[PDB]
mmCIF file of C-alpha atoms in Angstrom:
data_model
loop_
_atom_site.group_PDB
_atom_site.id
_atom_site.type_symbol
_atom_site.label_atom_id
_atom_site.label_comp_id
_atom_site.label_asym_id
_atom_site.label_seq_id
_atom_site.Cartn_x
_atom_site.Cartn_y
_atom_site.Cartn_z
ATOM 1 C CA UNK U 1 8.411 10.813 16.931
ATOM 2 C CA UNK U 2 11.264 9.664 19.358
ATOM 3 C CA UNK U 3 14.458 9.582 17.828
ATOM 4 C CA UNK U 4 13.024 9.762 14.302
ATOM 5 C CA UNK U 5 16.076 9.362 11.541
ATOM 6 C CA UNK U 6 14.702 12.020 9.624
ATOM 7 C CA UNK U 7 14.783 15.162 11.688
ATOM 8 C CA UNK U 8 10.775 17.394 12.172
ATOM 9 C CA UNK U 9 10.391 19.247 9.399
ATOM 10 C CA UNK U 10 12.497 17.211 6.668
ATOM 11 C CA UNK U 11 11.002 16.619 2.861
ATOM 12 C CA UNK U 12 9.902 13.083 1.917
ATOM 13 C CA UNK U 13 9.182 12.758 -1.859
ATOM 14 C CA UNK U 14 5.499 10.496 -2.090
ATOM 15 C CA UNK U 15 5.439 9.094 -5.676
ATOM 16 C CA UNK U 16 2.017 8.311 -6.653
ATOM 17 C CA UNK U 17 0.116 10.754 -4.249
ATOM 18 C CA UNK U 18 -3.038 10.560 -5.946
ATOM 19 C CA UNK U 19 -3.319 7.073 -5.080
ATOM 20 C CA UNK U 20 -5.704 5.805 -2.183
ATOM 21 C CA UNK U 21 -3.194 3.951 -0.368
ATOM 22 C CA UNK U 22 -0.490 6.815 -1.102
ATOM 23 C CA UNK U 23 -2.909 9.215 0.247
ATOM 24 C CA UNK U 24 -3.212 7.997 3.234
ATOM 25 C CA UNK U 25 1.084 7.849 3.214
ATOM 26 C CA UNK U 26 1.115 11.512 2.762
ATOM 27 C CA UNK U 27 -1.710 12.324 5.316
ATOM 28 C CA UNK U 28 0.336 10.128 8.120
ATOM 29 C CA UNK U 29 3.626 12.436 6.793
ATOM 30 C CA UNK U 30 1.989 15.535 7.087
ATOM 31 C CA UNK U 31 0.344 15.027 10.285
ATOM 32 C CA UNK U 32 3.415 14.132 11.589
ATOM 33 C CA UNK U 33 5.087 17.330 11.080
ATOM 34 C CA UNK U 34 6.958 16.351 8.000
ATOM 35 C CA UNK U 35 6.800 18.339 4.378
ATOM 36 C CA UNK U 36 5.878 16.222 1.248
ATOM 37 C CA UNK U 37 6.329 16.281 -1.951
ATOM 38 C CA UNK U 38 3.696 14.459 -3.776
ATOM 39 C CA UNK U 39 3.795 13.376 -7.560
ATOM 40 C CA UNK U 40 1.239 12.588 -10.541
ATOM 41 C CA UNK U 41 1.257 12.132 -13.668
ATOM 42 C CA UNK U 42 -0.304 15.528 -14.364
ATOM 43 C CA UNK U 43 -1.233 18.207 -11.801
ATOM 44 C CA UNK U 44 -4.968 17.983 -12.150
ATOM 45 C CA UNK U 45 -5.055 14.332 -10.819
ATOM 46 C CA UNK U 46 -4.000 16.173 -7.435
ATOM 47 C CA UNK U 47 -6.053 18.920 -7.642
ATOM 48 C CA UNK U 48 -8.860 18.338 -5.007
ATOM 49 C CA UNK U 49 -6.090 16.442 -2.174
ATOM 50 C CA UNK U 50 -4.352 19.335 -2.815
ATOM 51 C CA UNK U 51 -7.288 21.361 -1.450
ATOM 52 C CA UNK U 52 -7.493 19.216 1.453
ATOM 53 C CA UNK U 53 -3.699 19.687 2.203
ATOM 54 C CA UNK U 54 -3.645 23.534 1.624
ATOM 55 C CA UNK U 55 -6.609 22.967 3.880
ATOM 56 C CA UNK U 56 -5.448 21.192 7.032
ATOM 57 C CA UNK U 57 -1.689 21.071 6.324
ATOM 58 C CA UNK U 58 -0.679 24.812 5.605
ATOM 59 C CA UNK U 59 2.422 25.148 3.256
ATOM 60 C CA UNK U 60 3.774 21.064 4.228
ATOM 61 C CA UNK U 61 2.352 19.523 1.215
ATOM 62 C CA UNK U 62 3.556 20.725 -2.525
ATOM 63 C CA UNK U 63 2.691 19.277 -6.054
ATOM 64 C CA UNK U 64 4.959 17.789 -8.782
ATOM 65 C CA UNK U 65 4.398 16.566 -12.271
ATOM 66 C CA UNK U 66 6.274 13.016 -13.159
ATOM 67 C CA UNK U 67 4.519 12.307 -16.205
ATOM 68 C CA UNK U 68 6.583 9.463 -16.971
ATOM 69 C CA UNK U 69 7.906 6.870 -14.102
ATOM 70 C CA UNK U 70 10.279 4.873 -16.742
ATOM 71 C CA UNK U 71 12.028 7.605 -18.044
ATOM 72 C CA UNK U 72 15.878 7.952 -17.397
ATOM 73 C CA UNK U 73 16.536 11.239 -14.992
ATOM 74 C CA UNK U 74 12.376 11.005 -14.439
ATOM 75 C CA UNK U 75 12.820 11.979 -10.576
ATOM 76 C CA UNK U 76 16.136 14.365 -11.151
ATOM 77 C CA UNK U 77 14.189 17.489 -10.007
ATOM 78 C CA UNK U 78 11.558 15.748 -8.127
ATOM 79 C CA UNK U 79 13.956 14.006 -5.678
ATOM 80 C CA UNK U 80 16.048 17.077 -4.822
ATOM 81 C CA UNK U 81 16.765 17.911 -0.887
ATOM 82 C CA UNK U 82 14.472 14.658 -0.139
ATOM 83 C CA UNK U 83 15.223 13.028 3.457
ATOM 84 C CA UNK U 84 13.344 10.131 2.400
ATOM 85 C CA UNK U 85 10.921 8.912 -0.498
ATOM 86 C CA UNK U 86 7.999 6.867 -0.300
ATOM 87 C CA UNK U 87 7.267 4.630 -3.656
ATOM 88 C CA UNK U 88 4.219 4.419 -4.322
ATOM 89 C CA UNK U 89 3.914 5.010 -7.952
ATOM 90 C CA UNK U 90 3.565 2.228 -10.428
ATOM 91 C CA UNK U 91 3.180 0.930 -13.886
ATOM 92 C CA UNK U 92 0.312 -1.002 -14.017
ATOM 93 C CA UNK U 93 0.178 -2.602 -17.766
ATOM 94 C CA UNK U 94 -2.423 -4.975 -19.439
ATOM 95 C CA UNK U 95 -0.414 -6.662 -22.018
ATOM 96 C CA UNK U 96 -1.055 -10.160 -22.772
ATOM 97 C CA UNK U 97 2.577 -10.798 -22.909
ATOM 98 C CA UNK U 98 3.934 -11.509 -19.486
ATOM 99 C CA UNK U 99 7.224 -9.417 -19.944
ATOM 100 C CA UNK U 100 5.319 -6.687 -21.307
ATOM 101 C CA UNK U 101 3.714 -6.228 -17.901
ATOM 102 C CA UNK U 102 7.009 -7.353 -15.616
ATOM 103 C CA UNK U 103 9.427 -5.443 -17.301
ATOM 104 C CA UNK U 104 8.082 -1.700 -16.831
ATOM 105 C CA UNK U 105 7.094 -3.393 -13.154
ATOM 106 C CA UNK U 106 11.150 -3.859 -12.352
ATOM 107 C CA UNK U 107 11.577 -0.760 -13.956
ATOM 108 C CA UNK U 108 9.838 1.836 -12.693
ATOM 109 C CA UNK U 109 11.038 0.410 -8.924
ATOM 110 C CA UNK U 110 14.892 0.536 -10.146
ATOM 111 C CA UNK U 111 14.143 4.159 -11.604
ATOM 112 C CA UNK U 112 12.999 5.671 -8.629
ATOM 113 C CA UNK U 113 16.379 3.728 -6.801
ATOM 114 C CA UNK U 114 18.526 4.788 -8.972
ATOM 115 C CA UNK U 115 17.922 8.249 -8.137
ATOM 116 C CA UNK U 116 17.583 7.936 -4.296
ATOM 117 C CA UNK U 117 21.184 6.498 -4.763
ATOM 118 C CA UNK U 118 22.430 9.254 -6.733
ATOM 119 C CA UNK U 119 20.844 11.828 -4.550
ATOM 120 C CA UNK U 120 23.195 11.986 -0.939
ATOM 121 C CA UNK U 121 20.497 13.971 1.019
ATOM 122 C CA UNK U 122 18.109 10.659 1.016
ATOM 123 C CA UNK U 123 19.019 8.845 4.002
ATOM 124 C CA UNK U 124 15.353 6.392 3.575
ATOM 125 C CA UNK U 125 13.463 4.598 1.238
ATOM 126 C CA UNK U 126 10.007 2.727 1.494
ATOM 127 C CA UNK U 127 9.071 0.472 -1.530
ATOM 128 C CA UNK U 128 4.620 -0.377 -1.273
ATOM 129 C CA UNK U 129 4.445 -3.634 -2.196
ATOM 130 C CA UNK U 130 1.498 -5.663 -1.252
ATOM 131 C CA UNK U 131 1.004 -9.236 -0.005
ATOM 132 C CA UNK U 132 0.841 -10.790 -2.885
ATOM 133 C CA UNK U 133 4.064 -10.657 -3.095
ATOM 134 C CA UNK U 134 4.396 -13.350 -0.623
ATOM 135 C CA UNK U 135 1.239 -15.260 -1.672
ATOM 136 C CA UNK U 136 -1.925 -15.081 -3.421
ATOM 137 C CA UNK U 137 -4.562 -16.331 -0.505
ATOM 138 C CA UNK U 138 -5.926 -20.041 -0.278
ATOM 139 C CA UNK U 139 -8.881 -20.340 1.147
ATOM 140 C CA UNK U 140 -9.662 -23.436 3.752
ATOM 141 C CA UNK U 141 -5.318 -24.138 3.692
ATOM 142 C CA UNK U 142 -3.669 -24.416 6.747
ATOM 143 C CA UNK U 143 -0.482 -24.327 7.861
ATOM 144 C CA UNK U 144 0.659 -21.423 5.805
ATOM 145 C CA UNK U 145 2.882 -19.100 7.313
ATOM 146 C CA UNK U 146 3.867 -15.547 5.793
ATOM 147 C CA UNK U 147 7.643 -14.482 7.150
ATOM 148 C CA UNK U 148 10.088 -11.898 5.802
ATOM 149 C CA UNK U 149 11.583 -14.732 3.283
ATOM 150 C CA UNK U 150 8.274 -15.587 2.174
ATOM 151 C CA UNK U 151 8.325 -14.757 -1.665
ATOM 152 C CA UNK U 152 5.171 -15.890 -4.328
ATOM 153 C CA UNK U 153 7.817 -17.778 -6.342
ATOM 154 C CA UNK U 154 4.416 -19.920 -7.539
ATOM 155 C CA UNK U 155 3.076 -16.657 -8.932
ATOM 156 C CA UNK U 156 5.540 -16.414 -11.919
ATOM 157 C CA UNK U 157 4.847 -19.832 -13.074
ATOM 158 C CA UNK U 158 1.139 -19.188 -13.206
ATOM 159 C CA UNK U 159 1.673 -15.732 -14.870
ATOM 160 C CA UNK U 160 3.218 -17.302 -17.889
ATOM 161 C CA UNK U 161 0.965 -20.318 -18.439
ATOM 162 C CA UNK U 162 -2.301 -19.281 -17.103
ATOM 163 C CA UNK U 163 -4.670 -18.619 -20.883
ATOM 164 C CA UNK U 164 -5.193 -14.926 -14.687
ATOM 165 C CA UNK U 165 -5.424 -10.721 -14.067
ATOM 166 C CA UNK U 166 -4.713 -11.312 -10.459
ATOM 167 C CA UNK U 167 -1.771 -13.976 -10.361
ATOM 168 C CA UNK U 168 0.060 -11.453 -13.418
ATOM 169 C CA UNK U 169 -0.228 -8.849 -11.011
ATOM 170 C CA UNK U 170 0.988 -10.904 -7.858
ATOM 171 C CA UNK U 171 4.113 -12.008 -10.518
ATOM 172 C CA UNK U 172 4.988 -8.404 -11.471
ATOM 173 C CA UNK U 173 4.563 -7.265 -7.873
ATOM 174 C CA UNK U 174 6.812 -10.038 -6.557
ATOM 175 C CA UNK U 175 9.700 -9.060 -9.184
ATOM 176 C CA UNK U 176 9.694 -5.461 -8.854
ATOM 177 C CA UNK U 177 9.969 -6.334 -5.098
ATOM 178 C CA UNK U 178 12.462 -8.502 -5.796
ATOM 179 C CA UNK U 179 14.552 -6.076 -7.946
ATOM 180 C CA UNK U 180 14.399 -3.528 -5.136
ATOM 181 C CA UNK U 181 16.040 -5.990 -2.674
ATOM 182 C CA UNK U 182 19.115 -6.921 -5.400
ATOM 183 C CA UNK U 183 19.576 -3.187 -6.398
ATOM 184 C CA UNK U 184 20.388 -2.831 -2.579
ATOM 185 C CA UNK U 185 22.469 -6.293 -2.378
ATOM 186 C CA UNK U 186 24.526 -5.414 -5.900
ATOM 187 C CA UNK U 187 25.107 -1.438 -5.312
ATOM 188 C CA UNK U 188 24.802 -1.071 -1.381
ATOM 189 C CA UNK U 189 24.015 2.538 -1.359
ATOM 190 C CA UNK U 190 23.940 5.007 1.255
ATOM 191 C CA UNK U 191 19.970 4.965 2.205
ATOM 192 C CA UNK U 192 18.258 1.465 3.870
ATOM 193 C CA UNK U 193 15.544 0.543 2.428
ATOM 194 C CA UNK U 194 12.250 -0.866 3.951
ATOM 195 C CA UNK U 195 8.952 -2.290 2.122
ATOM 196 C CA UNK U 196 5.615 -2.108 3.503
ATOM 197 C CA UNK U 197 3.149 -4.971 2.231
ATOM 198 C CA UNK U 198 -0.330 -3.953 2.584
ATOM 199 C CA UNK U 199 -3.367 -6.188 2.127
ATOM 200 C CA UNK U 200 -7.069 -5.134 1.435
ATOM 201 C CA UNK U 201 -6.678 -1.306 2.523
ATOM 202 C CA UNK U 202 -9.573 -0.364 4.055
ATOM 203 C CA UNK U 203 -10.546 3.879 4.988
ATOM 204 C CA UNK U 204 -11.390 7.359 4.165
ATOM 205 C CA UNK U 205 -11.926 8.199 0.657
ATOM 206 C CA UNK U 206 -10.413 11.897 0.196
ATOM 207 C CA UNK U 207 -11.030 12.311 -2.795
ATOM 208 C CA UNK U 208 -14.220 9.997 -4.467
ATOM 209 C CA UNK U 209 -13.949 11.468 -7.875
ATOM 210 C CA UNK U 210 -10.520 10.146 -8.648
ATOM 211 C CA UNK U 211 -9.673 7.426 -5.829
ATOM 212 C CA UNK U 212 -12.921 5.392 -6.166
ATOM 213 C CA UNK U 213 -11.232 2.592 -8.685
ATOM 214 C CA UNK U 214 -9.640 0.971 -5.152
ATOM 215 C CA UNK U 215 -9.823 -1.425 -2.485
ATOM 216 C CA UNK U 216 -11.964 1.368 -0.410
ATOM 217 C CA UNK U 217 -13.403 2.430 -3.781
ATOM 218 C CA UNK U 218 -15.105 -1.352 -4.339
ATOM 219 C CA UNK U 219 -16.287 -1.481 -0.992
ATOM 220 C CA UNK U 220 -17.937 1.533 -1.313
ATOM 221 C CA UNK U 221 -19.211 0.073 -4.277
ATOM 222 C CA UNK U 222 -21.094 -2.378 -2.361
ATOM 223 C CA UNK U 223 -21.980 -0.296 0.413
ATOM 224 C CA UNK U 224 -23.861 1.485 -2.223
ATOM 225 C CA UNK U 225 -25.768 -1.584 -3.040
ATOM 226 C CA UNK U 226 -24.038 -2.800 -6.385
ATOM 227 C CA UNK U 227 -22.911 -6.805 -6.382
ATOM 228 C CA UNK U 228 -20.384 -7.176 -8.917
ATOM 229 C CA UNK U 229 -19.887 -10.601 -10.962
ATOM 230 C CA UNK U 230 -16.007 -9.881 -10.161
ATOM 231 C CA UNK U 231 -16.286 -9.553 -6.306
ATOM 232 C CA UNK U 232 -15.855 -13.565 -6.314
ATOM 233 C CA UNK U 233 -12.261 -12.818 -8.119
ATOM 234 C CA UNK U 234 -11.188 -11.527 -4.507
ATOM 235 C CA UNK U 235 -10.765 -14.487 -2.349
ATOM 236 C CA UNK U 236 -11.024 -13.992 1.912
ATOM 237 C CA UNK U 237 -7.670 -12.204 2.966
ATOM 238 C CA UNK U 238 -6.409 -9.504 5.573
ATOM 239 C CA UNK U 239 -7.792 -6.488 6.252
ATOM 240 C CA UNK U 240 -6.000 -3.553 7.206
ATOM 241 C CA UNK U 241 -6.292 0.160 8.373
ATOM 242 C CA UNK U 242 -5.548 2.916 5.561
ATOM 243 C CA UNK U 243 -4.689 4.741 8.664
ATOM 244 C CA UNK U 244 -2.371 1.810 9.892
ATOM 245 C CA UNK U 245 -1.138 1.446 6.480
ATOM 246 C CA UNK U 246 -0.068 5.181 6.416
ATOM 247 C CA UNK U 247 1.903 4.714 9.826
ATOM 248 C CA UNK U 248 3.632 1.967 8.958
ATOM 249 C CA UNK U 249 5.381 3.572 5.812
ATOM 250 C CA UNK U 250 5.921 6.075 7.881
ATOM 251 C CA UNK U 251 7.462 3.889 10.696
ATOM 252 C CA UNK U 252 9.757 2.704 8.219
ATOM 253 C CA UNK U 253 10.760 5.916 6.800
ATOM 254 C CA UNK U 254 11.724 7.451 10.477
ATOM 255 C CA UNK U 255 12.277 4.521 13.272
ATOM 256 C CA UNK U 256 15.467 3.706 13.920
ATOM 257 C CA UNK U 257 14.761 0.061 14.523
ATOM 258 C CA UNK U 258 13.418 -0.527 11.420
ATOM 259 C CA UNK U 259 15.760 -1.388 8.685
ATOM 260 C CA UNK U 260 15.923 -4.087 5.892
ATOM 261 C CA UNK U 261 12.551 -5.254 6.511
ATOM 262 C CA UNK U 262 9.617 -6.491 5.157
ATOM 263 C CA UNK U 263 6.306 -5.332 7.068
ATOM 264 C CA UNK U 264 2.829 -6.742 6.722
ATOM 265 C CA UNK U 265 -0.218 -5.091 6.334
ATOM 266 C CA UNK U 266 -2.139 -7.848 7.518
ATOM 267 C CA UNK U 267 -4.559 -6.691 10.490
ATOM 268 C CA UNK U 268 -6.986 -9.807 10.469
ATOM 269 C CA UNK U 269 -8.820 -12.025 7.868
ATOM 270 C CA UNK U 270 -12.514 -10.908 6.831
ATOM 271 C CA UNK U 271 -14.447 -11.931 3.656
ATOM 272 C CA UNK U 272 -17.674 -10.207 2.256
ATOM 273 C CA UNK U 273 -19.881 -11.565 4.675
ATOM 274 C CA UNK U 274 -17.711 -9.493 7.688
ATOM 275 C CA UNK U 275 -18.004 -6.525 5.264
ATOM 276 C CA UNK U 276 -21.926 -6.666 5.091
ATOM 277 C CA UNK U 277 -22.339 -7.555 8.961
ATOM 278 C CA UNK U 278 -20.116 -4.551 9.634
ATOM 279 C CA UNK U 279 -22.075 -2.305 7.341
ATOM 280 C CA UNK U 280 -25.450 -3.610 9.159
ATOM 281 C CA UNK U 281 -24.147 -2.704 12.588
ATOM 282 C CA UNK U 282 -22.953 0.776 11.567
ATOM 283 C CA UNK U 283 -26.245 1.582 9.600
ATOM 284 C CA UNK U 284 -28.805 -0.771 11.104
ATOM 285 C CA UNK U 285 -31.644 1.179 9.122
ATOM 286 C CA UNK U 286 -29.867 1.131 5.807
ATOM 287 C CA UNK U 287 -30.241 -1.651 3.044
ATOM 288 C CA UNK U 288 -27.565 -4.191 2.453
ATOM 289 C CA UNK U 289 -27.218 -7.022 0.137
ATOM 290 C CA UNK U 290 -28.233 -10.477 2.019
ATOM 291 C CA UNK U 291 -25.174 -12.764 2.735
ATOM 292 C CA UNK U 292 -23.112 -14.273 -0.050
ATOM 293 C CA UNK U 293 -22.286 -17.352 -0.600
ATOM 294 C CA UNK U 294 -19.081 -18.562 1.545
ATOM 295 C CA UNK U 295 -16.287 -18.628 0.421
ATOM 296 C CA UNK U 296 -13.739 -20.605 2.935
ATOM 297 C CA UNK U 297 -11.583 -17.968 5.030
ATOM 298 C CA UNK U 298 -8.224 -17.386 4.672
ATOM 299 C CA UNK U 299 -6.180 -19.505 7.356
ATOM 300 C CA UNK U 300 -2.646 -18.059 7.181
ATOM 301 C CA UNK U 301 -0.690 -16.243 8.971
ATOM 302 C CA UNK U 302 1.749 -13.363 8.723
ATOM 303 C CA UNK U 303 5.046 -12.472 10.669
ATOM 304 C CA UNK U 304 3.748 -9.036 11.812
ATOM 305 C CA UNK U 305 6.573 -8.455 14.356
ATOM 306 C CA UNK U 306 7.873 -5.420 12.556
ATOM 307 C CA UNK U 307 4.462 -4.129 12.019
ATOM 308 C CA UNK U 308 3.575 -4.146 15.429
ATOM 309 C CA UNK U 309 6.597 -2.784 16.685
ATOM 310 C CA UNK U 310 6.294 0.716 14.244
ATOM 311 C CA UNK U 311 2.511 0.941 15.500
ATOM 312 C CA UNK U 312 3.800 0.619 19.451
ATOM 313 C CA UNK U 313 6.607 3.409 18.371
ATOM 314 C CA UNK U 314 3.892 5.516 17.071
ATOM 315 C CA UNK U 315 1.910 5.202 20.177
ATOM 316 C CA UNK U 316 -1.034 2.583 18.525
ATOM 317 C CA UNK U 317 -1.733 -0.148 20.871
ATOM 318 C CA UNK U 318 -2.464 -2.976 18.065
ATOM 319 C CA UNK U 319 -4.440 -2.808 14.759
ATOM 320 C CA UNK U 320 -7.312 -0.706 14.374
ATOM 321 C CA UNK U 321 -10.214 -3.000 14.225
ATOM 322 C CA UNK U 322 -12.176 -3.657 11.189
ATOM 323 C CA UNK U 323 -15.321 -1.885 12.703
ATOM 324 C CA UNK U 324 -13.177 0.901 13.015
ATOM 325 C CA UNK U 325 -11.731 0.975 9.792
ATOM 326 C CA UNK U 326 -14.839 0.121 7.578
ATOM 327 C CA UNK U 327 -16.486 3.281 9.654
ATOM 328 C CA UNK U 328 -13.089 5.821 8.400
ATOM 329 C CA UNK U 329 -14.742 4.108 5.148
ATOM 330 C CA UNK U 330 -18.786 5.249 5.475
ATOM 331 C CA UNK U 331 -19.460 6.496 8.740
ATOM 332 C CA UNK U 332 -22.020 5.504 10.960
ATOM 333 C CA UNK U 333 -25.850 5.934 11.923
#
């Protein structure tokens, strides 16, 4: 990568490499050149990626335990000799009390700061948000535009009052990105930070036996012929890449022109009906569910200045297209 801050060869620490979307982070890492350091909460949950690493990555990609995200010193060994760290882990709790669910949100983000600040060899630092910390989509609305200032203040309010799932999630996601921005304003530490803000991640399943409960995952589902009651709890939105979403965090972690920003995931807007005329064209003999019922699309629009720029850097012309990345998903013919 021209003039990449971290030099060939340097460590970044990817918490939460078991993940799908985290996956895909460490893939874009290794086949890049770089050596990771991937964490879970217990070394079986990267078992089988590890496989895949050992397998196509020889001695780049290594395995550590952080059983605990909120725990003070959690990343003290973990984060040693890093060049940069991708966050990626998260607590994700169910408590009907809206603090209960915010609080280890802000905290797990600050933990994983506080360390990169305390630890002089990290020079970068990508947060994964998601979009929703901008806005939850609304279908048929126009005029909505998505820019680095955006933030889904409206998400909060709902989150307290609401007797839902989704806009608790978009409220913790919103303040833990929130917190990672003040940490950097209050303490102004020696590493930049960046935050990538994927949509609906769309591409290769590594590992099916533990990464199926995921944006891929439910696709797959329906691929597969199952129509969940809950797929009408996903509104239309943006697509975008796995792949894309991989070299954007790493974009942020190793182009100089990237600093301080906030980059969007955002590729282009499809709702179930693209998914199922996508899966028709790539397996025109296979059964798919008939068309849904519609469901509006989603008319915004995102700033995706920064996100274009990393994929240019990287030598990408654009966004991969959703043919494309529903095919990294199930193939073809």
């Amino acid at each position: 990568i021209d003039n990449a801050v971290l030099p060939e060869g340097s460590l970044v620490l990817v918490t939460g490499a078991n993940g799908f979307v985290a996956s895909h982070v460490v893939e874009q890492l290794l086949e890049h050149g770089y050596k990771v350091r991937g964490t879970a909460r217990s070394a079986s949950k990267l078992a089988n990626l590890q496989k895949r690493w050992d397998a196509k990555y020889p001695g780049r990609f290594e395995t550590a335990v952080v059983e605990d995200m909120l725990k003070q010193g959690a990343y003290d060994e973990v984060i040693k000799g890093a060049a940069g760290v991708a966050h990626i882990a998260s607590v994700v709790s169910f408590s009907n009390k809206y603090d209960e669910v915010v609080t280890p949100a802000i905290g797990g983000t600050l933990n994983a700061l506080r360390a990169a600040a305390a630890t002089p060899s990290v020079k970068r630092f990508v947060l994964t948000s998601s979009t929703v910390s901008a806005l939850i989509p609304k279908p048929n609305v126009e005029g909505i535009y998505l820019d680095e200032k955006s933030w889904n203040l409206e998400s909060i309010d709902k989150a307290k009052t609401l007797p839902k799932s989704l806009w608790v999630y978009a409220a913790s996601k919103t303040e833990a990105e929130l917190a990672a921005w003040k940490f950097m304003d209050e303490n102004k530490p020696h590493f930049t930070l960046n935050a990538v803000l994927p949509n609906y991640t769309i591409g290769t399943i590594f590992d099916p036996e533990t990464q199926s409960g995921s944006t891929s995952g439910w696709m797959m589902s329906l691929f597969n012929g199952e129509v969940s009651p809950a797929l009408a709890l996903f509104p239309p939105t943006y697509y975008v890449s796995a792949v894309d979403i991989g070299l954007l965090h790493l974009g942020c972690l190793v182009l100089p022109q990237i600093e301080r920003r906030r980059v969007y995931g955002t590729a282009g807007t499809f709702d179930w009906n693209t998914v199922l005329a996508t899966f028709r064209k790539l397996y025109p003999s296979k059964t798919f569910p008939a068309d849904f019922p519609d469901q509006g699309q989603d008319l915004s629009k995102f700033d995706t200045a920064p996100s274009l720029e990393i994929l240019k850097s990287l030598g990408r012309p654009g966004w991969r297209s959703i043919e494309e990345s529903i095919k990294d998903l199930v193939g073809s013919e």
